[PDB]
Design an enzyme around this catalytic site. Structure first.
Site: not given
Ligand SMILES: Nc1ncnc2c1ncn2[C@@H]1O[C@H](COP(=O)(O)OP(=O)(O)O)[C@@H](O)[C@H]1O
Ligand SMILES: [Mg+2]
Ligand SMILES: CC(=O)O[C@H]1C(=O)[C@@]2(C)[C@H]([C@H](OC(=O)c3ccccc3)[C@]3(O)C[C@H](OC(=O)[C@H](O)[C@@H](NC(=O)c4ccccc4)c4ccccc4)C(C)=C1C3(C)C)[C@]1(OC(C)=O)CO[C@@H]1C[C@@H]2O
Ligand SMILES: Nc1nc2c(ncn2[C@@H]2O[C@H](COP(=O)(O)OP(=O)(O)OP(=O)(O)O)[C@@H](O)[C@H]2O)c(=O)[nH]1
Ligand SMILES: Nc1nc2c(ncn2[C@@H]2O[C@H](COP(=O)(O)OP(=O)(O)O)[C@@H](O)[C@H]2O)c(=O)[nH]1
Ligand SMILES: [Mg+2]
Lengths: 426, 412, 330
Positions: C245, C248, C99-102, C97
């Protein structure tokens, strides 16, 4: 707690007979008889190696894996041979060819499922499982190949329980086989990546230690085996006894392996004096550390004096002063600061049981994790290349469904394994 | 009024069996009398079994003897997190079931061995879960911290830098008895190169008897458990004083036994008699609780101490005018029928906080780094529900324990 | 630099909103500080990295580190290293959560695409805009999940079974029967991404929550074929690009013993590898992830990691842990 021995191959098997020959007496279990135990303490913890069925028949919980009938049919037709439940005998009447490939991919791969079957019947025995003991030689088929498979499967089935491996690494001076480095390099490979405690013994490190540390002039195999089995008893079974400061496979593991490779040790017994005369009794204690820590007396081929140590585990078993024990260990750590590695303030892992080896007053198993064993895998690895280069007896492997990249793999792997180990000698 | 006790780790249990022995021994309650008031925890059955097989077998309730047939593991992580966790509930239950049965208690005398698996880890969360369930009490943990050079486990520091940081914010007063520095006493002040663990235990088994046993026992100058932490800790860090005993004379060799107060008290400050390799190399005392027992005239003390207060070479902290809690009991000590302890008619179990441990902690912290610096046996904890966090973040922890024990002293 | 490290803090997420969380992270230059919510009166712990990305607000903010900014600092230079003939790696590390995937894949819309699509787009753009008859190229891609020591092909819906990583006795580790697809255009590689990203979050993935418990590895084999008119022959230059990616970092409760073990082992091993790489100016076989990527983590290779950070007070412990992990990478 518990464990389930594994007699892979003939050697590993031959030794089984000696490891159980001993251990039993160190637990008062006659052939099929029960617990005649001179005491009452050699019973409260037996479970570690047996099972309750009749009430006088505590059967060794080991496995006998081999593709050569005659062997197990020599171990089962002799002394203690009639204590193993037949279910234990996982034979492979096939041609137990001396090929690592013949007992790991083609012939052994079949007999495996009929083994794992039992290794599960024994694991799911009762109480809580600790790990499995594995005996074999890295210089043959049923040993290095098929036994090295048995573990790769075991370690997928219970990546929780431990895996001690007792390997008879190919002695230097003379090789009791020809492809040896082939069957070896290939099995060490499997070891460095499954079992997490390996005790490497050398048929010639034994002779020596058995012909000069025991004026013994005719050291039959039975003997060598016997000496070895003496150490593996001090290790396991022993610690499953009381003690001012007792440990158990894990402690041994969690104090001896700084880095995940698995690392291999070199066992050493304490009172190793010739029968009559020598019976000097100079066993106050400084005499045991005197012993254990000398070059000769290390079942390994290499000499500690040729490379630092990472860890050491003097698993003593005989009433002594936690002072004269804890103390000695120190001077030892200072007289030889040179070789004992520094980034570990206290390399040594003092362990202390109470009851000693049945007929003795005081003993102490030594399990050393020295960087010296670098100079052995080197050896092995050398022999390989010198012959791999010409693909010597390679057709006996490939022709058995092998790969030209398989041999490459192992050597490298095990070859890198040499590298790393040096990363600490420095 | 009372003080439960939780002996954790094989050691804390061996020492336990010992301290527990000395007890009945000086209370006329043979093998089978009343009922203890403590518990026994270990993740290696065979050891607690020794209390189930050996002496003082039926003096306990199979209910105050907790075991986890599973595995001990000489590693914090596993004992604290992974395995040790499973048992804790159950453990607590007794220290909540035994804590209820009583009448207005005062705390739990905890017995653990800093550098172990079941002793470091487990307790860590036991004391942890206590500080929350009974923040309103005393948490004096009696530890046996790492021999300065004669350690055992290969990892020891990993396990002790971790039991310190996790317990620090939970204990009231942590007593410390150094395993090695006790041997010296067995070599130099009793003469015997044959000291079985069973002895060191008889010793702490003594110094401890002077703490609870006799103190919670009427006298001419009673000292409650609270008393300690109050008169003994200048600051919230679960401060660790050191245990020391006076008449540690041999019941065979020499015999000057009749060593009036004036002597036994001076014999406490000489560094070769303090169950801790923390020789007052500079560490300024900052509070001492001189617990006396036996035939002692308050003036004898309020004089023997006066003489000391003016030896200067015994330099006490600045911000501390007077730091001498004189605890006087009646009943003299009670030596094992035939061990090796002299058996005098008066003793001095003086414990104290000394800027000295600035050392002992230092030397034990450094250890840690060396190994962590290479991760050494790290994979053994990580794979046990820990992280680069808990280590690095427990290192930083003690760091401010090296500064703490430095600031509260050495400066005016 | 052979090892670059960046941290990036995101906007509050839903859990934090419902928690009325305070922001405990602040940034300045290359420095990121973190406040201990239980100790507001301290000075915050400080950390310095190659980049500290402040994305806690939004593109409407003048100071917001956009997907474009992050890619142009870290991704762009990596692609260039690949054109120069060597292997590269980009890891996203951090709590679920955070921000890795984002950061790596981002979103499908305008403006929100992560490092992977931006790098792929940049690659094909440089290729198609390469003017020279002697230079032709080939781009092959693989997309997989590493879960509990076993591999899942994200580009093959019926990946029938779990493929093993193996070590060719001469050419290195590889995933058996893993599909490697040749792509000749961006929209085509984009198709594969979307298809793979889709497979990562289907309903069945919630059984073992593999979207946050497995490592997702997107591999590109970039081959540059150089013709030469003088003495007429092509010389091939092959670069391997691995965009990861990671699982967690908090699962290294409710986590199964073996999932946790493997994930801890994987992340712990990766940390040692990278610190060693940064040292040079190595236990690869210790985990399947570091074993499969050994060649992209060699002394020739180049690696970068982007550690995702939650801004809120409630994640202080995990976020500190992530910062320490990034600080060790070096
Ligand atoms: N820099 C950012 N700007 C906008 N939304 C972000 C950003 N980083 C993360 N998010 C949001 O936060 C959530 C967590 O990121 P992902 O979902 O990337 O999780 P994780 O780190 O588990 O892979 C997602 O809903 C994503 O849209
Ligand atoms: Mg992810
Ligand atoms: C009269 C007397 O005291 O005899 C001793 C004896 O003379 C000596 C020489 C024994 C003897 O051992 C050997 O000669 C030997 C033969 C082959 C290989 C290795 C050793 C002995 O045979 C061995 C035997 O060992 C034991 O009883 C231990 O319990 C040992 N048992 C076995 O190895 C064993 C042997 C046969 C059948 C079943 C078990 C043991 C050690 C470690 C862990 C478990 C068990 C002992 C003390 C003796 C004899 C009988 C002469 C010594 O060995 C051991 C292992 O104790 C050799 O140096 C020591 C010193 C002993 O004093
Ligand atoms: N004084 C004293 N010290 C002891 C005793 N037993 C062990 N120790 C010391 O305490 C430490 C040993 O801890 P271990 O016995 O290894 O472990 P444990 O704390 O019981 O818990 P586990 O590691 O899980 O077995 C060493 O530093 C020993 O020197 C004892 O009976 N008395
Ligand atoms: N110590 C010892 N070594 C043995 C024994 N039997 C064979 N060996 C060694 O094992 C190697 C040969 O392998 P072998 O056991 O015949 O293989 P396998 O039977 O085909 O699995 C040689 O190095 C021998 O010295 C034994 O009973 N004791
Ligand atoms: Mg124990």
């Amino acid at each position: 707690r518990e464990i389930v021995h594994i007699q892979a191959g003939q050697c590993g098997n031959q030794i089984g007979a000696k490891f159980w020959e001993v251990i039993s007496d160190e637990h008062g279990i006659d052939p099929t008889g029960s617990y005649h135990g001179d005491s009452d303490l050699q019973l409260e913890r037996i479970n570690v190696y047996y099972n309750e069925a009749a009430g006088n028949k505590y059967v060794p919980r080991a496995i006998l894996v081999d593709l050569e009938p005659g062997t197990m049919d020599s171990v089962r037709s002799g002394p203690f041979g009639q204590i193993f439940r037949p279910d234990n005998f996982v034979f492979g009447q096939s041609g137990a060819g001396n090929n690592w490939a013949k007992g790991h991919y083609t012939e052994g791969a079949e007999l495996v499922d009929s083994v794992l079957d039992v290794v599960r019947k024994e694991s799911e025995s009762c109480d809580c499982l600790q790990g499995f003991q594995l005996t074999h030689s890295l210089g043959g088929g049923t040993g290095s190949g098929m036994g090295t498979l048995l573990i790769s499967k075991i370690r997928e089935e219970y990546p929780d329980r431990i895996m001690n491996t007792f390997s008879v690494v190919p002695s230097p001076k003379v090789s009791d086989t020809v492809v040896e480095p082939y069957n070896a390099t290939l099995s060490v490979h499997q070891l460095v990546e499954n079992t997490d405690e390996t005790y490497c013994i050398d048929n010639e490190a034994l002779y020596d230690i058995c012909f000069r540390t025991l004026k013994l002039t005719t050291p039959t195999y039975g003997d060598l085996n016997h000496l070895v089995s003496a150490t593996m008893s001090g290790v396991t079974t022993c610690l499953r006894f009381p003690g001012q400061l007792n440990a158990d496979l894990r402690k041994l593991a969690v104090n001896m392996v700084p880095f995940p490779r698995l690392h291999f040790f070199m066992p050493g017994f304490a009172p190793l004096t010739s029968r009559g005369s020598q019976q000097y009794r100079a066993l106050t204690v400084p005499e045991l550390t005197q012993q254990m820590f000398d070059a000769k007396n290390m079942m390994a081929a290499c000499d500690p004096r040729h490379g630092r140590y990472l860890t050491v585990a003097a698993v003593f078993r005989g009433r002594m002063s936690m002072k004269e024990v804890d103390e000695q260990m120190l001077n030892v750590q200072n007289k030889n600061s040179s070789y004992f590695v520094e980034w570990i303030p206290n390399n040594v892992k003092t362990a202390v049981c109470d009851i000693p080896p049945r007929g003795l007053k005081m003993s102490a198993t030594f399990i050393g994790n020295s960087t010296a064993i670098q100079e052995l895998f080197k050896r092995i690895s050398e022999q390989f290349t010198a012959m791999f280069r010409r693909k010597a007896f390679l057709h006996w492997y490939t022709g058995e469904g092998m790969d030209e990249m398989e041999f490459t793999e192992a050597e490298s792997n095990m070859n890198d394994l040499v590298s790393e180990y040096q990363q600490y000698q420095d | 009024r009372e003080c439960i006790s939780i002996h954790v780790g094989q050691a804390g249990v061996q020492i336990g069996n010992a301290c527990w022995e000395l007890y009945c021994l000086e209370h006329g309650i043979q093998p089978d009398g009343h009922v203890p008031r403590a518990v026994f925890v270990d993740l290696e059955p065979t050891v607690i079994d020794e209390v189930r097989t050996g002496t003082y077998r039926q003096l306990f309730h199979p209910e105050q003897l907790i075991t986890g047939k599973e595995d001990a593991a000489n590693n914090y992580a596993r004992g604290h997190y992974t395995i040790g966790k499973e048992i804790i509930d159950l453990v607590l239950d007794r220290i909540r079931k035994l804590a209820d049965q009583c009448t207005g208690l005062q705390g739990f005398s905890v017995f653990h061995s800093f550098g172990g698996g079941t002793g470091s880890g487990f307790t860590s969360l036991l004391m942890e879960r206590l500080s929350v369930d009974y923040g309103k009490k005393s948490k004096l943990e009696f530890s046996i911290y790492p021999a300065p050079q004669v350690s055992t486990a290969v990892v020891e520091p990993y396990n002790s830098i971790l039991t310190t940081h996790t317990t620090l914010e939970h204990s009231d007063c942590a007593f410390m008895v150094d395993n090695e520095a006790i041997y010296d006493i067995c070599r130099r002040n009793l003469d015997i190169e044959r000291p079985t663990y069973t002895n060191l235990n008889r010793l702490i088994g003594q110094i401890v008897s002077s703490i609870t046993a006799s103190l919670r026992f009427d006298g001419a100058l009673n000292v409650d458990l609270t008393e300690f932490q109050t008169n003994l800790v200048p600051y919230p860090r679960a401060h660790f004083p050191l245990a020391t005993y006076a008449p540690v004379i041999s019941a065979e060799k020499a015999y000057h036994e009749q060593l009036s107060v004036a002597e036994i008290t001076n014999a406490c400050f000489e560094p070769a008699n303090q169950m801790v390799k923390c020789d007052p190399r500079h560490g300024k005392y900052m509070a001492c609780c001189l617990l006396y027992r036996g035939d002692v005239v308050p003036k004898d003390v309020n004089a023997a101490i006066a003489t000391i207060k003016t030896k200067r070479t015994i330099q006490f902290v600045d911000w501390c005018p007077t730091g001498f809690k004189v605890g006087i009991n009646y009943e003299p000590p009670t030596v094992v029928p035939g061990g090796d302890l002299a058996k005098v008619q008066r003793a001095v179990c003086m414990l104290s906080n000394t800027t000295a441990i600035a050392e002992a902690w230092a030397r034990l912290d450094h250890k840690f780094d060396l190994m962590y610096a290479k991760r050494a046996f790290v994979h053994w904890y990580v794979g046990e529900g820990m992280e680069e966090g808990e280590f690095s973040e427990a290192r930083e922890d003690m760091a401010a324990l090296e500064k703490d024990y430095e600031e509260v002293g050495v400066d005016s | 630099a052979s090892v670059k490290v960046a941290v990036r803090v995101r906007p509050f997420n839903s859990r934090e909103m419902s928690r009325d969380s305070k922001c405990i992270i602040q940034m300045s230059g290359s420095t990121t500080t973190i406040v201990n919510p239980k100790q507001p009166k301290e000075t915050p712990k400080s950390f310095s990295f190659d980049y500290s990305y402040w994305s806690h607000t939004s593109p409407e903010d003048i100071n917001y580190a956009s997907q474009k900014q992050v890619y142009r600092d870290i991704g762009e230079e990596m692609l260039q290293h690949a054109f120069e003939g060597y292997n590269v790696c980009i890891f996203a590390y951090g709590q679920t959560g955070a921000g890795k995937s984002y950061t790596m894949m981002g979103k499908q819309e305008k403006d929100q695409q992560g490092i992977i699509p931006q790098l792929c787009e940049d690659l094909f753009s440089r290729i198609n805009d390469t003017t020279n008859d002697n230079m032709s190229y080939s781009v092959e891609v693989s997309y997989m999940e590493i879960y509990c020591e076993r591999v899942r092909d994200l580009l093959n819906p019926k990946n029938k079974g779990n493929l093993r990583v193996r070590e060719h006795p001469l050419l290195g580790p590889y995933v058996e029967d893993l599909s490697k697809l040749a792509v000749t255009s961006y929209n085509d590689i984009q198709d594969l991404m979307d298809s793979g990203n889709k497979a990562r979050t289907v309903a069945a993935t919630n059984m073992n929550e593999t979207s946050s418990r497995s490592h997702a590895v997107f591999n590109i084999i970039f081959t540059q074929k150089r013709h030469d008119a003088e003495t007429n022959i092509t010389t091939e230059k092959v670069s391997k690009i691995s965009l990861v990616d990671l699982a967690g970092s908090e699962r290294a409760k409710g986590t199964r013993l073996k999932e946790g073990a493997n994930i801890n082992k994987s992340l712990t091993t990766l940390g040692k590898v990278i610190s060693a790489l940064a040292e040079m100016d190595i236990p690869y076989r210790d985990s399947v992830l570091t074993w499969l990527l050994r060649e992209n983590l060699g002394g020739n290779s180049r690696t970068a990691m982007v550690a995702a950070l939650s801004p809120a007070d409630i994640n202080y412990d995990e976020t500190l842990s992530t910062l320490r992990y990034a600080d060790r990478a070096k």
